[PDB]
Curated annotation (Swiss-Prot), chain A:
The gene is rpsE. One of its GO terms (biological process) is translation. One of its GO terms (molecular function) is rRNA binding. This is Small ribosomal subunit protein uS5. Altered uS5 proteins have been identified in a number of mutants. Some mutations in uS5 have been shown to increase translational error frequencies. Some mutants in this protein can partially suppress an alanyl-tRNA synthetase mutant. With uS4 and uS12 plays an important role in translational accuracy. Many suppressors of streptomycin-dependent mutants of protein uS12 are found in this protein, some but not all of which decrease translational accuracy (ram, ribosomal ambiguity mutations). Pfam families: Ribosomal_S5 (PF00333), Ribosomal_S5_C (PF03719). InterPro entries: Ribosomal_Su5_D2-typ_SF, Ribosomal_uS5, Ribosomal_uS5_bac-type, Ribosomal_uS5_C, Ribosomal_uS5_N, Ribosomal_uS5_N_CS, Ribsml_uS5_D2-typ_fold_subgr. The N-terminal domain interacts with the head of the 30S subunit; the C-terminal domain interacts with the body and contacts protein uS4. The interaction surface between uS4 and uS5 is involved in control of translational fidelity. The keyword Ribonucleoprotein applies. Residues 10-73 form the S5 DRBM domain. HAMAP family: Ribosomal_uS5_B.
Curated annotation (Swiss-Prot), chain B:
Belongs to the universal ribosomal protein uS3 family. It comes from Escherichia coli (strain K12). Binds the lower part of the 30S subunit head. Binds mRNA in the 70S ribosome, positioning it for translation. Plays a role in mRNA unwinding by the ribosome, possibly by forming part of a processivity clamp. The lineage of its organism: Bacteria, Pseudomonadati, Pseudomonadota, Gammaproteobacteria, Enterobacterales. This is Small ribosomal subunit protein uS3. It comes from the Bacteria. Part of the 30S ribosomal subunit. Forms a tight complex with proteins uS10 and uS14. With proteins uS4 and uS5 encircles the mRNA as it enters the ribosome, which may play a role in mRNA helicase processivity. Some nascent polypeptide chains are able to cross-link to this protein in situ. In collided ribosomes contacts ribosome rescue factor SmrB.
UniProtKB/Swiss-Prot annotation, chain E:
This is Small ribosomal subunit protein uS11. The modification N-methylalanine is found at residue 1. The lineage of its organism: Bacteria, Pseudomonadati, Pseudomonadota, Gammaproteobacteria, Enterobacterales. Has been predicted to contact the N-terminal domain of IF-3 based on footprint studies; exactly how IF-3 interacts with the 30S subunit is controversial. Part of the 30S ribosomal subunit. Interacts with proteins uS7 and bS18. Cross-links to IF-3. In stalled ribosomes contacts ribosome rescue factor SmrB. The gene is rpsK. Gene3D superfamilies: Ribosomal protein S11 (3.30.420.80). One of its GO terms (cellular component) is cytosolic small ribosomal subunit. Located on the platform of the 30S subunit, it bridges several disparate RNA helices of the 16S rRNA. Forms part of the Shine-Dalgarno cleft in the 70S ribosome. PROSITE patterns: RIBOSOMAL_S11 (PS00054). It comes from Escherichia coli (strain K12).
Curated annotation (Swiss-Prot), chain G:
Disulfide bonds: none annotated. The chain holds residues 122 to 241 of 241 of the full protein. One of its GO terms (molecular function) is structural constituent of ribosome. Part of the 30S ribosomal subunit, contacts bS1. Some nascent polypeptide chains are able to cross-link to this protein in situ. In collided ribosomes contacts ribosome rescue factor SmrB. The lineage of its organism: Bacteria, Pseudomonadati, Pseudomonadota, Gammaproteobacteria, Enterobacterales. This is Small ribosomal subunit protein uS2. The keyword ATP-binding does not apply. The gene is rpsB.
RNA sequence: CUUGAGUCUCGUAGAGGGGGGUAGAAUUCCAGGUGUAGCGGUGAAAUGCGUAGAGAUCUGGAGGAAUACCGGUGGCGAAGGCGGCCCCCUGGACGAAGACUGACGCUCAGGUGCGAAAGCGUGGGGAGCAAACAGGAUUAGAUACCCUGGUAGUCCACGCCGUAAACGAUGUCGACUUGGAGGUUGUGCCCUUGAGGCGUGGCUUCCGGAGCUAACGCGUUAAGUCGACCGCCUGGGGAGUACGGCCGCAAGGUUAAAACUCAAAUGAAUUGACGGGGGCCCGCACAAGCGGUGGAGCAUGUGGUUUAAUUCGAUGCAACGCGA
RNA sequence: GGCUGUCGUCAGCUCGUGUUGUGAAAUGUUGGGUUAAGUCCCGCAACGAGCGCAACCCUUAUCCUUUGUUGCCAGCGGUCCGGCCGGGAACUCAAAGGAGACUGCCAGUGAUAAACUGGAGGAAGGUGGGGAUGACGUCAAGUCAUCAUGGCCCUUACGACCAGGGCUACACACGUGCUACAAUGGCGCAUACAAAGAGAAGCGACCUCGCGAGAGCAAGCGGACCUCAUAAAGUGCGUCGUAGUCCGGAUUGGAGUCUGCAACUCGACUCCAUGAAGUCGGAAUCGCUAGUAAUCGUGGAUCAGAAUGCCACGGUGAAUACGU
RNA sequence: AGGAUAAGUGCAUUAUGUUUAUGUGGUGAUUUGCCCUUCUGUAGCCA
């Protein structure tokens, strides 16, 4: 029954909660749906939507789905090495290189999602849909446009990426 | 929220109850009120410990 | 529509349900349609549209055998 | 509806007979629940027919029970388009029971001095094709024999069937395609 | 909607044979018997005993129309028959069977159904 | 719809500052485990040292 | 199979037996086997979508036989072919071949010393 | 220069444009012959037409729109636009070899030019249908729904400001990116073996991969990868109106706004319910019957109505021989 | 709060969990065929398990089986020929172990198939007959009035003792049920067989009284012992013709009774004379598949006093189930 | 006599599957919305 990935650190970021209705066909039951984010400290594509009778059983379901069919991904230093504009499904987010002298600057549940992602110093404005369910894809799409450091000279910088497989 | 009658309509047809005594005729009423009273007052006296079932028998 | 000639395995009543295909095929197969010069391409002339449902019906005969419903 | 077909049950015999045509005649002659009178009502009737002619006790009974008796019935069905009918062939068991029912309603209002005289005269009257349910048998069979030219919602059913595999003819159907 | 069945009453031809013309629609049938020289020996229609609605065009009102007209042309002393058919309308088959069951031959069932070229505009005051 | 073996039931009723609370607690031990079982004999042949009073046989 | 499944209503027992048989016939693969398999052998694509669907989710490498109504992408190893009958399904995957029989001569120095009998 | 585009003869497809020619049959009418009562309309229906002889039918004349089925997801035109068939005058596109020119290219503010339809001036013309107007049917009515008479209109041609869902729905045009197949077509090859296959182009459409969307969907005709250069948007309602410039006999058209109101408005989709869109299923719920309440009288409850008060609780199925 | 009615025996709902989509959420829990059934053949992302349903369960049916009275009697005695009693155990018979029957078989049907129908022996075949038997849960559904209970009010009272009046009035309508309108029935005379159960302030043989119901006294009782109890319809014969009768018997005069100082309106039963409404009831409308439905009596719960009902029993005991 | 591909016996209402009146606005389900991990970390929030 599946392989799972782990981090040596705890994430229990509950982002949303909902309830399921059929309203006449068996009427309406007490069930909830839930969305929970499991990072790594440097990032994961870990996002899980699950559902059950009660809120606790529901979140723990959703926390399980945030670590199966998912793998961890990694980025050196608290910044991102590319000024790129991550888009995922109308929720569009921005990054530009920065200092360590600034840490996070963000609010709500977003400051908690960016800390595990490693893209919190580079944190620039979000636009399009910025309600909780889709705003939180920073650590997914913003780590699939990824750049990360491996060179010793800027003029060997494109040469060094070519010889990584040649 | 229909709440089917969860145990009353299920007893005595190889399903034991919390009383076992015999009475009949018109005095069944005098024995049942007395059995309620002893159920109410006796478990209150032994309430020092928790208790799992109660069976009174004549 | 009854047609002058007779059907296969024939009897003394001629009928169109066996050996007609072009008779009243756009002359009275119409319902309240007015005089038009381009509206039929999407109103009337649904041959691409109607061919699909027939194709789907030939597709399902293979697929019932393949699940072994027979 | 109905998840399954369900047939008739066993019916018990009566203390004066072992023949079925007699036991089924006393049964639908039963009113107030009391068959033990109806036993006599059947045998007192049959003796009066038998005095009218002595060749049999069954003379007028057997052809009345053919003549006031239907063969076919018509239901009315429509869920769109225009109004239609669907004829059905029915079981002997119900053909017989309409006929016996109609004989015992007609005879009890016939108003003669004995229930024995009333039934022998009302079977004598329908036997000769001039009693009271000859009209009812003739009208009901005419309507079912006639509505065989119709089918449930014919106008859309004629295209609907040939698209979903079916015939190009004109046929009656049980509330479906044709 | 029936012609004279009784003798001497109207002009007779007594030519043993005729042709019938059937105009089949979704709202009526007109069945009209004529002489082979081209003169009407009788007619009927499907409102000849008061069918109305859909029921006015169906096989059974088409049949009784054919049975009213076929009756009369036995006093005009006709015995044999031919038929012309005009429309993909209902009772177009029940009508043939009725002529032949009336005690006539129906060997030549000649489709001559006319073609309009759609020169008119049909009644619309609605969405369809 | 069970009607065989005793199975344990309680209706609590209690109040606190805001008003009344309650739990309906059905618990299920066994479908032939627990309770009585159906008796497996008549009481009529057993434990009878003399199979008659007279019965016409003396 | 010993006969030890009896009940005073025979219907409830024989009906459980027919449905037990369907479980035996459906599960017979993982049933006698020590755990999750080291490859997954999908013969059909055309109706048995699920067997490929779950192999990608457990990460277990796929050994695939694809037909001309299926793509050779998204599975790790292919036989180009057709999905039916013995035309590609054991004509390379049996003792008649040499390539399923020279892999197995490379098992005989890795986890075993002799195991070539077992396999076709 | 050709790697872009342009052009000659050769061939080919098509309802492009302008102008000519031509036949048969339903509705409609007249006439004569034959012939008698419904015909019509529709969901069902009535109003309508008809005994002054209708409806239908044989023969022969009248007349104008209209032209099937072939006709297809086809093809053509600049986009909207083009439809009986044929020719004359001529456009614009599609293929192929010989031959030529050789960035002559791309986009486009302004601009001039240009209509499906009705609106609309005059000329042509009127069989059927129709806003209006009447009358029927429907109903709380009935202007919607549905029908029947019935006119301008429809129907033709040009002409006046060219309206719109005036579209590869996707600006213009072009380069590049796994294909296969449908429709249907130049042409090489085939048993020309059935709208086919392969070779190589064609518009035009299904299907789906790399990539894209919020979803439908797109995918070699992009909504991909992009290019140049122009158009246009900044919440909704109120407004495609006002206001300004301009064109128009003349109603109008054209780009295109706020105070005020208001927290929304708006693209998509899940499941319930629901179709009067298509179809499937069940309970003695009907049927197949039989009997019962409702009607009599009584028993008993309910309300109505009454008095000091005739106590409530409950209101088809989920109240009324029930708490009580 | 506790508690329960509905959809419905819908034939589906839910618990844990994976997966597909960005997700809401689906999927399963949906299709075909089959069913009381998530039962069973086929099959797609559903997997595992529970609920509804199946089961254990009490009961019946023959039949085996034991007890042998407060039950029974083939032969036998006392004998009016009654298990009352000497006596007997073949026998029902009571309450219980249960046996037997499983859609298991065979055949048809059914997609191979679950299963339905037929077929047969037998007491009995449709998951043997009967009953138990009803999911999660919206419905702001209904009870604060069994009872629990806060916020929160009276506590010379929204408590409590005592009498009398009223729901049950009467105008009618309405729910339900009862018994009639017939003759399958009523009448007259003669004639028959139950099952079950209730009785410790009670009922109750005999007793004396009584038109009958009942009355007070009391042996007796614990209800298979004693009593309610003449069980009635039904059966036998004769009789009756749609006439309110040969059906129905309400009202009302007038007498007799019950629990209790006390029966007038509000209570119940007996009985004498006369005598009306009612001819199978319109709109509406339900229950029922067989011990049912119909119909007649019986007892009981309730119960100070009493039933037309309900509840359960036994008499006599039906048509049909194609079809949606 | 080509109305003779005889239906290519390839055929099935043949392309709008349509119509006989309606009935206001909001309202159900919780005050710990809490029971998976070292370091880089988390749901009021922590190793």
């Amino acid at each position: 029954a599946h392989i799972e990935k782990q981090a040596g650190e705890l994430q229990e970021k509950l982002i949303a909660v909902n309830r399921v209705s059929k309203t006449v066909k068996g009427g309406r039951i007490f069930s909830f749906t839930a969305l929970t984010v499991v990072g790594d400290g440097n990032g994961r594509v870990g996002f899980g939507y699950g559902k059950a009778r009660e809120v606790p059983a529901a979140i723990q379901k959703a926390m399980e789905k945030a670590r199966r069919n998912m793998i961890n991904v990694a980025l050196n230093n608290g910044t991102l090495q590319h000024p790129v504009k991550g888009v995922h499904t109308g929720s569009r987010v921005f990054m530009q290189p920065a200092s360590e002298g600034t840490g996070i600057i963000a609010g709500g549940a977003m400051r908690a999602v960016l800390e595990v992602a490693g893209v919190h110093n580079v944190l620039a404005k979000a636009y399009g849909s910025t309600n909780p369910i889709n705003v939180v894809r920073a650590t997914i799409d913003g780590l699939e446009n990824m750049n990360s450091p491996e060179m010793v000279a800027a003029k060997r910088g494109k040469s060094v990426e070519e010889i990584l497989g040649k | 929220g229909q709440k089917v009658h969860p145990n009353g309509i299920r007893l005595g047809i190889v399903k034991p109850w919390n009383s076992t005594w015999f009475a009949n005729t018109k005095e069944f009423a005098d024995n049942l009120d007395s059995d309620f009273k002893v159920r109410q007052y006796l478990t209150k006296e032994l309430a020092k410990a928790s208790v799992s079932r109660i069976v009174i028998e004549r | 529509p009854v047609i002058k000639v007779r059907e296969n395995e024939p009897f003394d009543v001629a009928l169109r349900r066996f050996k007609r295909s072009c008779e009243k095929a756009g002359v009275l197969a119409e319902v309240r349609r007015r005089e038009f010069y381009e509206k039929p391409t999407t109103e009337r002339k649904r041959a691409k549209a109607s061919a699909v449902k027939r194709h789907a019906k030939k597709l399902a005969r293979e697929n019932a055998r393949r699940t072994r419903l027979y | 509806p109905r998840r399954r077909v369900i047939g008739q049950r066993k019916i018990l015999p009566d203390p004066k007979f072992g023949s079925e045509l007699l036991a089924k005649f006393v049964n639908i002659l039963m009113v107030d629940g009391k068959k033990s009178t109806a036993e006599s009502i059947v045998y007192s009737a049959l003796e009066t027919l038998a005095q009218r002619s002595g060749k049999s006790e069954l003379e007028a009974f057997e052809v009345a029970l053919e003549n006031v008796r239907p063969t076919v019935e018509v239901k009315s069905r429509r869920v769109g388009g225009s109004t239609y009918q669907v004829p059905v062939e029915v079981r002997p068991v119900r053909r017989n029971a309409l006929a016996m029912r109609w004989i015992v309603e007609a005879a009890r209002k016939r108003g003669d001095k004995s229930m024995a005289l009333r039934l022998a005269n009302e079977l004598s009257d329908a036997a000769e094709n001039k009693g009271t349910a000859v009209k009812k048998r003739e009208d009901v069979h005419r309507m079912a024999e006639a509505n065989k030219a119709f089918a449930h919602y014919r106008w859309l059913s004629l295209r609907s069937f040939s698209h979903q595999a079916g015939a190009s003819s004109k046929q009656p159907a049980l509330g479906y395609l044709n | 909607a029936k012609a004279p069945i009784r003798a001497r009453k109207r002009v007779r031809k007594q030519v043993s044979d005729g042709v019938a013309h059937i105009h089949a629609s979704f709202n009526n049938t007109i069945v009209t018997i004529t002489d082979r020289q081209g003169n009407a020996l009788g007619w009927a229609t499907a409102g000849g005993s008061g069918f109305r609605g859909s029921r006015k065009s169906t096989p059974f009102a088409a049949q009784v129309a054919a049975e009213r007209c076929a009756d009369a042309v036995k006093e005009y002393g006709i015995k044999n028959l031919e038929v012309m058919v005009k429309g993909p309308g209902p009772g177009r088959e029940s009508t043939i069977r009725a002529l032949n069951a009336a005690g006539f031959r129906i060997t030549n069932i000649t489709d001559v159904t006319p073609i309009p070229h759609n020169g008119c505009r049909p009644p619309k005051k609605r969405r369809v | 719809h069970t009607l065989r073996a005793d199975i344990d039931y309680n209706t609590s009723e209690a109040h606190t500052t805001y008003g009344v609370i309650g739990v309906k607690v059905w618990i299920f031990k066994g479908e032939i485990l627990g309770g009585m079982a159906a008796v497996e004999q008549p009481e009529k042949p057993a434990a009878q040292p003399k199979k008659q009073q007279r019965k016409g046989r003396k | 199979q010993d006969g030890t499944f009896d009940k005073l209503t025979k219907k409830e027992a024989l009906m459980r037996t027919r449905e037990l048989e369907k479980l035996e016939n459906s599960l017979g693969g993982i049933k006698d086997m020590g755990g999750l398999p080291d490859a997954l052998f999908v013969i059909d694509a055309d109706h048995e979508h699920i067997a490929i669907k779950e192999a990608n989710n457990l990460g277990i490498p796929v050994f695939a036989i694809v037909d001309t109504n299926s793509d050779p992408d998204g599975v790790d190893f292919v036989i180009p072919g057709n999905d039916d009958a013995i035309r590609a399904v054991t004509l390379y995957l049996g003792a008649v071949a040499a390539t399923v029989r020279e892999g197995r001569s490379q098992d005989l120095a890795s986890q075993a010393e002799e195991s070539f009998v077992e396999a076709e």
